Symmetry: C3
Subunit: 113 residues, 3 copies
């Protein structure tokens, strides 16, 4: 599950963006794309280092596939995509990574445990 | 605290939905309804498995009352409600469960510790 | 990173609020304001304890600077601000505090590790 909150306006989010995220996250995490969920929230009231220049606050939740090297690799990918598609500088992006226990993720009337 | 983000439109969220979630969560968690917070965010730009068919990304935070069996039960309850009231398929819902330490939840100028 | 979700309408958020939050959080956390991110989301569909008087659901993520006494101090400051500026009663504010590992925070194409 990847969520991006940004002050970039909705009209600046290119068509195809959610599919591009889905695809690249599936490749990066090694997870099947059927399990990948993405959520983009434009037009937000936000600031980064006191400034309202384009920025993004993001989260990536996964059951495993979270760790030092893997998170570095995710950040390079995701900042790269935010720069190329939303014109957000990578140094105005935070991404919180969460390694979820399977018992703590609900789906399809039960959990993954 | 229960949060639902969904691509279902605002008009499709029935009047009374926040009160129903409040009541059912109070019953499920055993907590008084005065402590239950609910937040529904419709009209979102999101996808699940690459698809923009109705879906939901949710979170349930609680000080205790989180665990393997309890979270299975919550997921049956909450996917049931999202299916009945918002017409979302349970297999397009993720719920992240968070067992919060009392010291890490702020309220009324202090924390719950 | 501080996020506030509230039912208070956008027109009730005073000019300067994101700067005030940035400033006061820099002071409270001891971190330079260049590293502080803030995000205010008004006009939400939310209830707290069964009712829809002004309320807020918030999160504060930090690499360290999270703990029992510190979090009590943050709650005093942030509930104070939300009361003074948004007219939200402190007993209708929840703030979830997250102590993030540096390896689990992405920024500038890498992590903080």
């Amino acid at each position: 599950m990847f969520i991006v909150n940004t002050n970039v306006p909705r009209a600046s989010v290119p068509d195809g963006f959610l599919s591009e995220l889905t695809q690249q996250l599936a490749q990066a995490t090694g997870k099947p794309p059927q399990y990948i969920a993405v959520h983009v929230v434009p037009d937000q009231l936000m600031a980064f280092g006191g400034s309202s220049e384009p920025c993004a606050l993001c989260s990536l939740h996964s059951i495993g596939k979270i760790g030092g090297a893997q998170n570095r690799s995710y950040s390079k990918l995701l900042c790269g995509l935010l720069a190329e598609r939303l014109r957000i500088s990578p140094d105005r992006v935070y991404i919180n990574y969460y390694d979820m226990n399977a018992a703590n993720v609900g789906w399809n009337n039960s959990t993954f445990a």
